[PDB]
Curated annotation (Swiss-Prot):
Residue numbers bearing the Phosphoserine modification: S3
Quaternary structure and partners: Monomeric.
List of residues binding heme b: H93
Name this protein carries in UniProt: Myoglobin
Gene: MB
Family that this chain belongs to: Belongs to the globin family.
Chain sites annotated for binding O2: H64
Molecular function per GO: heme binding; metal ion binding; nitrite reductase activity; oxygen binding; oxygen carrier activity; peroxidase activity
Length: 153
């Protein structure tokens, strides 16, 4: 449910992410992990990362953050008619990776925090509100696909 206006504010601020996808991605995962330490346990390759410093040095963490936001940008660019891009992600996240809807909320918070921290001037009240609705739409559609597949939404 976003207006055309809100989608344009989302994709305008996503333009900033697109100019450095891996750096934003690495910051999002570090914020996720440092705010909610338990999420780190879903990534078997990152169990030895015992500090923010180790996290910043990890080339695999930065690659995973890049892969994550490149996929999320693909979903945002479809503005809601994103069923095709969303399904495989809910499939893998519900079945292979075992990621609960709650962690999708934590990572939504980390994305907003990263955007606010890196682009304070470009991420004013209207852009923030629209990005919150866009990520809420992503979470709600992920939740609904989880239900369809027989999992908890
Ligand atoms: C904005 C939300 C997210 C996006 C767009 C996203 C995207 C992706 C993509 C594109 C992949 C690789 C392809 C695939 O397996 O589907 C992936 C893998 C993975 N994701 Fe996510 N993800 C998100 C949130 C999460 C969260 C919150 C967690 C757990 C805290 C998580 C855990 C994982 C794991 C464990 C893998 C496999 C990595 C490996 O094999 O080492 N994801 N994710």
């Amino acid at each position: 449910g976003l207006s055309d206006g809100e989608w344009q504010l989302v994709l305008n601020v996503w333009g900033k992410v697109e100019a450095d996808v891996a750096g934003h991605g690495q910051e999002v995962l570090i914020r996720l992990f440092k705010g909610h330490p338990e999420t780190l346990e879903k990534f078997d390759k990152f169990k030895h990362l015992k500090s923010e410093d180790e996290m910043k040095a990890s080339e695999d963490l930065k690659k995973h953050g890049n892969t994550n936001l490149t996929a999320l940008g693909g979903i945002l660019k479809k503005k809601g008619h994103h069923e095709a891009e969303l399904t495989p992600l809910a499939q893998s996240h519900a079945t292979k990776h075992k990621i609960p809807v709650k962690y999708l909320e934590f990572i939504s918070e980390a994305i907003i925090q990263v955007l606010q921290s890196k682009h304070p001037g470009d991420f004013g009240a209207d852009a923030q509100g629209a990005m919150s609705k866009a990520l809420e739409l992503f979470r709600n559609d992920m939740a609904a696909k989880y239900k369809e597949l027989g999992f908890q939404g």
